């Protein structure tokens, strides 16, 4: 399926609001990389964190071997910095997950073969 188009889901994790901000940063990064590669992107959906960032986002990536190029990015991404939310500005850690799955064609409907059925009337 490396040649297929793909979907990229970003979800915030342990950092809370910091993780949501980190997820938004990851979304921006991935969109920029897709633009560099010339793929076409469309936000399928995007849940936004209330204080900041996004809780989650699903993005559709279209192009030549988009799933091949993106599949290795599946995993959790750890971010370490000075929390721009903590009043004390302590050095915190936040986590965000990126999951890439290929676009799948809908299953062709199959008529129930009458030879496969036994009918009883009573």
């Amino acid at each position: 399926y490396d040649s297929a188009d793909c979907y990229l889901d970003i979800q915030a994790g342990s950092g809370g609001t910091e993780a949501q901000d980190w997820a938004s940063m990851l979304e921006r990064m991935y969109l920029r990389w897709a633009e560099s590669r010339g793929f076409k992107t469309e936000i399928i959906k995007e849940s936004e964190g209330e204080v900041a960032g996004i809780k989650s986002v699903t993005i559709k990536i279209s192009g030549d071997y988009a799933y091949g190029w993106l599949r290795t990015e599946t995993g959790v991404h750890r971010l370490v910095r000075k929390s721009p939310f903590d009043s004390g500005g302590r050095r915190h850690t936040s986590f965000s997950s990126a999951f890439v799955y290929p676009e799948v064609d809908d299953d062709i409907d199959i008529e129930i073969n009458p030879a496969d059925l036994r009918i009883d009337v009573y």
């Binding site: 342990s14 990064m29 190029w69 959790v76 750890r78 370490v80 910095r81 000075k82 986590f95 997950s97």
Partner: protein, 59 residues
């Protein structure tokens, strides 16, 4: 099958990480391949080709 994928998905927690982006040390390291860079700004702007190509080459 979808539920199996969800169960397989790594918990988004303190131990599970494929790439670490430490800005204070200005270092970014991919745990799987070992590829490390110092241009955090470029990577956050979208210079992921280094890590992606390294992962594909590693297979």
């Amino acid at each position: 099958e979808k539920q199996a994928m969800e169960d397989n998905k790594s918990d988004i927690g303190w131990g599970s990480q494929i790439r670490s982006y430490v800005l204070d040390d200005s270092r970014i390291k991919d745990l799987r391949t070992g590829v490390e860079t110092r241009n955090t700004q470029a990577v956050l702007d979208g210079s992921l080709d280094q890590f992606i190509e390294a992962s594909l080459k590693a297979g």
